[PDB]
Each structure stands twice: as C-alpha cells, then as structure tokens.
C-alpha cells in the first residue's frame, strides 16, 4: 500500500513532569501541554506501529506489517531513545522510554514474520539495548517499582518472546511476580492506592501490564496466571468493584476517586475475561470497549479473540 514516512528517531528524550502534589494526582495544565509537545514523536511513533499491526492482523494486508518494520526499523538504525534520558520535574523521560519501547516491542512481536534479516538484527540489537537500559534504570533503589516497574516488563517481556532470550524471559517473569508479589491479601496495590483521587486509576493502570505479560507467556507456553494465583483476580476484581461503586477506592485512599470510565489500557479485561473465576464481574468494564493502546500492541479486543501474534501466512 502506502507506508508514511516515518518521524526522526532521536536518541534523547526531554520529557517533563507535570505534577504539582506529592500524591501526584494534580495536573500542572501548562507543564501537561509542554510534555505533550515534547514527546509527541515518541506518542505518534507507537500509535502508528500498532495501527499498522492491527492492520497486518486482520489478514490480506502485509503492506501493513512491512510498514511497521520500516517504521521500528528506521528508529533501530538512529538509536532511538538509546541517547540521554532528561530529568525535569520527574523521570518522565525515563517513562516514555519505558512505555515506547512496549510500543515497539509489541508491534515487532506481532510483525517479526515479515522482518528481512538486516531489520531483524536491527530492530532486536535495538530492542535487546533498550531493555538493558530500562532494567539498569530500576537498579537505583529510590526509584519506586510501582505500575512504572509492570510496565516496564511490557518492553522486556515481548523482546523476550520475539528474540526467545531465556534471560530476558526470567528477567520479565521477576517483574511480572513482584507485581503479584506486592498484591496485598485485600486486593490493594499501597504504591498505587497513594494516588489519592486516581488510586482506582491506577490499580487499573498498574493491571493492565501484568495481564499482558502473563498473556505473552501462553506464547511460550508458560501459565503465568497460576503463580500465587488468586492475588491477580482480587486486585482485577477491586478494579472492576471501583467502576461499578468507587467506595472502597474512596475510603482506602483517603480522597473521593475521580468520575471516568473504562479506556484504552482498561482493556486488559478483554483478556482477563477469559481466565477469572469470576468472568461476569468484568462485563461492564467489557461493555465500554472496544479497547485500544498502542502501548499494549493495538487492539485489546481484537486481540483477545484472535491471539496477539497473527498467524504468518503461508
């Protein structure tokens, strides 16, 4: 078809926090604007390469994944987000590393059948340096491994599947089991439950990456899902509970939680529905899809039915 022309792939990043609370859960509205311009390329370029996977993924579309590669391969060749991580306000450039590089080890995953061998040592030499790198920034112990650390498994874990490194492959189940590990017996996240008015947000936000990498893990037919299984479901059933009637959010954080639905990265319940003990509790949260997050490799709902990997055509 017609591949657009990829955006520059600079190996810096300045991103800016744009909170003003110790809660983080107050928005700055100018220093939201300035990060939002700042990190547009990184925004756009994962938009893009999940958009053209789940073209790929409906069949008949190759074009499509070609065009993805092109795309993870032209950042692959300029170091992309390998350069110097600012530090303004926050570690938000840090974070957009985190979550672009999920964006693009996700859309690599879904794509790789069609990568010539130059982009596949490109594109995975880049992503195998980026999981280093997001990694070595969690060996500073002050840096909290809250929803930031789940999602950096995101990254990790779909290079580890793309490339089948074995130790990139225990490197994400230590993620994904510390985040199941800090599931409280209530069901609570404390790290996440410190938000204030955003703490179902982000118990929300911080279940939708172990569900992904648990996910990953049935294409390397691994259960993730039955490790410590239980404090998965409750913390996922809390979620969905707090849609529903945000009074345990309400009395836990101390704040009354702010009024949104279900969206984009909530639709971890597109796959969670199918491995609870309790699937009805999640047909509310499903009725408001579908779900997309470029983030998380596309469409949720699509690829909760279908599989996240396309079948390679033959």
Same mark, same amino acid.
């Given at each position: ?13 300045? !991103? ?10 107050? %928005? ?35 074009? !499509? ?57 490109? %594109? ?55 985040? %199941?590990?800090?599931? $409280? ?120 039915? $279908?599989? %996240? ?6």
């Amino acid at each position: 078809n017609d591949c657009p022309a990829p955006p520059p792939g600079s190996p810096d990043i300045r !991103a800016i926090g744009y909170y003003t609370d110790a809660a983080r859960s107050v %928005i700055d509205p100018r220093l939201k604007t300035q990060n939002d311009a700042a990190v547009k390329p990184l925004n756009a370029f994962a938009a893009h390469v999940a958009k053209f996977a789940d073209a790929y993924a409906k069949g008949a579309d190759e074009a !499509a994944g070609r065009c993805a590669l092109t795309w993870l391969d032209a950042w692959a060749r300029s170091g992309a987000m390998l350069g110097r991580m600012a530090h303004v306000n926050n570690d938000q450039s840090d974070y957009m590393r985190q979550w672009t590089h999920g964006a693009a080890a996700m859309a690599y995953l879904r794509t790789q059948a069609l990568a010539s061998e130059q982009q596949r040592t490109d %594109i995975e030499t880049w992503l195998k340096r980026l999981s280093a790198a997001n990694l070595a920034y969690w060996d500073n112990p002050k840096h909290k491994r809250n929803n930031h650390y789940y999602w950096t498994g995101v990254g990790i874990m779909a290079t580890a599947v793309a490339t089948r490194d074995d130790t990139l492959l225990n490197t994400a189940q230590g993620i994904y089991r510390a985040g %199941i590990d800090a599931i $409280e017996p209530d069901g609570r996240l404390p790290m996440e439950m410190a938000r204030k008015r955003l703490a179902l947000h982000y118990h929300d936000y911080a279940t939708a990456p172990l569900v992904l990498m648990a996910e990953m893990a049935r294409l390397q037919g691994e259960d993730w899902y039955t490790y410590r299984q239980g404090a998965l479901e409750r913390l996922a059933a809390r979620v969905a509970d707090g849609y529903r009637d945000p009074s345990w959010f309400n009395t836990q954080s101390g704040a009354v939680q702010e009024t949104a639905t279900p969206k984009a990265s909530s639709g971890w319940v597109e796959f969670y529905r199918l491995r609870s003990p309790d699937p009805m509790r999640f047909d509310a949260m499903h009725a408001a899809g579908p779900f997309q997050d470029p983030r998380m490799g596309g469409n949720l709902t699509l690829m909760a039915q $279908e599989g %996240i990997v396309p079948l390679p055509q033959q």
